[PDB]
Amino acid sequence: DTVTIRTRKFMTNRLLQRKQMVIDVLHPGKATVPKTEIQEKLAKMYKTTPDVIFVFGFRTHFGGGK
RNA sequence: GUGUUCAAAGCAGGCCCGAGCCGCCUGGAUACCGCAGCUAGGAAUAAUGGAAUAGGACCGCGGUUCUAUUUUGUUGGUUUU
């Protein structure tokens, strides 16, 4: 809910042939909607079939929210 | 520098764009160096120098003499400055 992947510091990694960015998602009261959702959500942002979108990170911010 | 939610701390960090911003962006300072040395300014202070039965400055020079090598095209010879 109210997810909004905020692609901060987007890096067209040309020598690793990829889109490289920081995922920064928002929440009402429950942090960290699941990773493969975020893949599928970052899929439809970029239309890139998200099983090539290999995400990680995803630590839950205190107070839900982000 | 830096909101680690304060803090112990870290070296961080911050954005806009919907997510084509295909990115933009701060940064990660400065302080310390036993000595000995080095460096170069000082020359007080503390030591420190000389002319004494004369020495120091002036090409004062003098006469002697050693020898060093440039030119005499060159070398060789000697000769000198």
Curated annotation (Swiss-Prot):
State the species of origin: Homo sapiens
Report whether Phosphoprotein shows up as a keyword of the record. Answer: yes
Residues with the modification Phosphothreonine, per the entry, are T7
Reported function: Component of the small ribosomal subunit. The ribosome is a large ribonucleoprotein complex responsible for the synthesis of proteins in the cell. Required for processing of pre-rRNA and maturation of 40S ribosomal subunits. Part of the small subunit (SSU) processome, first precursor of the small eukaryotic ribosomal subunit.
Disorder named in the UniProt entry:
Diamond-Blackfan anemia 3: A form of Diamond-Blackfan anemia, a congenital non-regenerative hypoplastic anemia that usually presents early in infancy. Diamond-Blackfan anemia is characterized by a moderate to severe macrocytic anemia, erythroblastopenia, and an increased risk of developing leukemia. 30 to 40% of Diamond-Blackfan anemia patients present with short stature and congenital anomalies, the most frequent being craniofacial (Pierre-Robin syndrome and cleft palate), thumb and urogenital anomalies.
Q: Which GO terms describe its cellular component?
A: cytoplasm; cytosol; cytosolic ribosome; cytosolic small ribosomal subunit; endoplasmic reticulum; membrane; nucleolus; nucleoplasm
Record's keyword annotation contains Acetylation: yes
Report the sequence similarity comment from the record. Answer: Belongs to the eukaryotic ribosomal protein eS24 family.
Assembly notes: Component of the small ribosomal subunit. Part of the small subunit (SSU) processome, composed of more than 70 proteins and the RNA chaperone small nucleolar RNA (snoRNA) U3.
Keyword entries, A-Z: Acetylation, Cytoplasm, Diamond-Blackfan anemia, Isopeptide bond, Nucleus, Phosphoprotein, Ribonucleoprotein, Ribosomal protein, Ubl conjugation
- Record-level Gene Ontology MF annotations: RNA binding; structural constituent of ribosome; translation initiation factor binding
Subcellular location field: Cytoplasm; Nucleus, Nucleolus
Glycyl lysine isopeptide (Lys-Gly) (interchain with G-Cter in SUMO2) crosslink - at what positions? Answer: K35
Q: Mind telling me what this protein is named?
A: Small ribosomal subunit protein eS24
User: Which tissues does the record link to its expression?
Assistant: Mature tissues, such as adult brain, skeletal muscle, heart, and kidney, express low levels, whereas tissues and organs with significant populations of proliferating cells, such as fetal brain, placenta, bone marrow, and various glandular organs, contain significantly higher levels.
Q: Which GO terms describe its biological process?
A: cytoplasmic translation; erythrocyte homeostasis; ribosomal small subunit biogenesis; rRNA processing; translation
